[PDB]
């Protein structure tokens, strides 16, 4: 009810809210490091380089008296967003990645806290996983079945692409 | 069997009921011997590889002690139950179609439903 | 004028009583190694008789149980209660007995909980803590507020028999205790139900309050004690045991609930351990869906529970709930996520039962 | 454990002396406590045979005065009772004759001549005014004397005569007493599965006479725990863990309480360590002594079965190392257990690997499904 209570026409999404953040006035007075952060996470997010970028960007915030103060109190949710994105992207990149590698790939306060986060992402359905503690591996899906339905899901995507492509070709025909 | 044998022993009178015609109780004894075999087949394998000792414990119950070396091989000859690796140096026994079975079950379910609806 | 106090305060009252008194005296009692215990048990034995009235006899008994439950081991009190045989008698009446009946129940419920018996405590307190009016049922209510009620005074004076504050025990302590119990008991069974294995059904006290909070438009950081307990519960659900332990203090600190016990450190660590166990259980229950396999070493380190406890709890539970889970003790590893064939067999059985029932009606 | 309390704990005279003599004979000849207390206790009574034994070495020094007085007072008492009974047989009153039979029974019992105590005890049969008091008390006596003469057959007999007898009162414990005697007979006669059912059944809340309150807790507890063949999950759960009444007895001996909690909770190592701890005391128990080795072994077998069914493949060496008991000893125990057929454990000691097994597989599930379908069809037919 409260969203209607604040003269908002409807509950917004974070992407929507961000656009106001995107707007220059918020941006103009906005510390630069945050604009960079937004690039690193929202614009061009790449797991193979995100850790480095964050490592070089996080030093600057700490040094600043004011920036650090703003930053100190959002460390937790920010970390959660970044790690959520890393888990999703890893879900896209891998099929069965080692627990050592997956935890290693994304920075965590503790190895066990990283597992906690991964499961939480799974419960909220941002990723489907099966964690085999015996072999220390994680699978982003009996074995042959999981491969069969992964194949089917790939074939489907391929068909969709082909269909779309055909549409584009039609336009080329006129040319 | 011990209970089965005793049941014949006590109700010896029922079997007898002419005496020459049934001098030896032949049919009842034959029937009992078939009856004894069924339970062993009932385990019915389903194990790829089975410890000898477990088999010995179960075959021990049968009256002949040596039957399992013999009783187990004999069962294989009958073909009621299948034994794999029997007589092996190791001494441990090894133990579309599916779709058809499933379809059969589905048919039964439908039949039951039909009778219910018709009822 | 004695029982509700400590052995010290009592012996002060007694000593001071004797200092005033003339040296020459007549006493039935003979001095014993413990002066106080022998006084209480002496008058106790005196009061109870076949001839003696239930209100007086039962009064005596209840006083014994109260004193003993405070200053002596719990088992003795339990034995007294079950041997004394008052069910009908305790409820009515003795005028002040009602307080003893509910007061002594509260007290053994408290001492048993001090002994860190949860299963016992929840057994003890449920009847009396189901009461909405419990504050009144313990005979503690401000005289004034009911003094306007009860008037006229003629009737009123008899009615306002509520026990004195010094005798009275704080409600927050009691409620927090019972809720802490009901938490430890009902959480893993809830979680499993969340798991949907549904081997057994369990009820946890304060469960209704938690449900109300979830449906609340606003969720605030915990302030009232039940909210701290609440946060500890949700923390158990998500598998943070450290958070849960933290929260109880936070709810407790405003409450002062745990500060009202002399042994508080001991119970802090004891509860820390029991919570470690049950939280480990809860974790396992909720997360067995996405985990096919586990590591007892890692789990042991991270729950701060030595493996001997871990393997035991997990194996026990799995065997009790008929969970499709397999443990290799040699490599110390666990397995889940399975059975189909067996399940179908069960369903068939159930169906057969239903059919039989229908036949009954048809007949 | 201290003897003073144990000897003090049991009301029965036979327990009071026979137990001391057992503890003395049972463990160490040398130890003072069994012999000193038995001596002093015997000297409080009319049996010079026991007194004569005490006089003998390993016993308190013989005294001329104690034996002569007992002996003479006995001669006198026997003459007296003999006459009184002569006269009672000749006022023609049943009660007096019954008392005489009872009094000859008492006299013989205290004098330590048990056969006669029994005979004259049951001679009160005919002259019983009523079965319930005259006859049931005769039963209680034959039960005491039979327990002490070590015929538990006869104990069961007079238990069935007593509890078979038509008049029964719910309020009276004697139910309790008879339960205890039966339990004791079963325990003296795989697991019985009767002893525990009996001991667990009720507590009088009054002195056992036959069974120590601790004795009922421990006997019930161990017998139950060892009844794998008979015991239900309820029998572990229903009749012991969930049983509130039995809790009373259990709280008496808390080591046994925790032993059972440990077993029920799957920590069999803890349980078996408790048992190892108590073993020396339990070998001192006059009734329990003979069954100790059996019950503990059975409990161990049950624990192995619980471990053994839950894991398809077992690392035996690791289990022995991680057992909290020696691996070699565990292997030996398993080897002993297996031949009996108690365990279907597939074990090579040398390998240290253990493996137990409970298209073929696929067919199995299919078969079950078909079975259920059959049942359903049957129900349909019945409905029609």
Residue numbers in the entry:
A (entry chain A): 354 to 494, 1000 to 1033
B (entry chain L): 406 to 422, 438 to 515, 1000 to 1023
C (entry chain C): 299 to 636, 1000 to 1024
D (entry chain E): 4 to 93, 121 to 219, 227 to 395, 1000 to 1025
Mind quoting what the paper says about this structure?
Eukaryotic translation initiation requires the recruitment of the large, multiprotein eIF3 complex to the 40S ribosomal subunit. EIF3 is a large and structurally complex molecular assembly that, in the majority of eukaryotes, consists of 11–13 subunits (eIF3a-eIF3m) with a molecular weight of 600–800 kDa. We present X-ray structures of all major components of the minimal, six-subunit Saccharomyces cerevisiae eIF3 core. Yeast eIF3 engages 40S in a clamp-like manner, fully encircling 40S to position key initiation factors on opposite ends of the mRNA channel, providing a platform for the recruitment, assembly, and regulation of the translation initiation machinery.
Many viral internal ribosome entry site (IRES)-containing RNA elements require the presence of eIF3. The recent structure of the 40S-bound CSFV IRES in complex with eIF3 revealed the structural basis of this interaction, with the IRES RNA occupying the eIF3 binding site at the 40S platform and creating a secondary binding site for the PCI⋅MPN core (Hashem et al., 2013b). Because IRES interactions are also mediated by eIF3a/eIF3c, we were able to model the interaction by fitting the eIF3a/eIF3c heterodimer into the 43S⋅IRES EM density map without any adjustments. This fit of the eIF3a/eIF3c heterodimer places two loop elements (between helices 2 and 3 of eIF3a and helices 1 and 2 of eIF3c) important for IRES and 43S binding (Sun et al., 2013) in close contact to two extrahelical bulges conserved within domain IIIB of the CSFV and HCV IRESs. Consistent with our model, these RNA elements are protected from RNase digestion when bound by eIF3 (Sizova et al., 1998; Sun et al., 2013). Based on the convincing fit of the eIF3a/eIF3c structure into the EM density, we attempted to dock the recently solved paralogs of eIF3e (CSN1) (Lee et al., 2013) and the eIF3h-eIF3f heterodimer (Rpn8/Rpn11) (Pathare et al., 2014; Worden et al., 2014) into the eIF3⋅IRES EM density along with older models for eIF3k, eIF3m, and eIF3l. Using the previously identified positions of the various eIF3 subunits as a guide (Querol-Audi et al., 2013), we fitted the models to agree with features of the EM density. The proposed arrangement defines the molecular interactions within the core subunits, with the HCV⋅IRES, and with the 40S subunit. Remarkably, even the helical bundle structure recently proposed for the 26S proteasome lid (Estrin et al., 2013) fits the remaining density after placement of the PCI and MPN domains, suggesting that it is a conserved feature of the PCI⋅MPN core of these functionally diverse complexes.
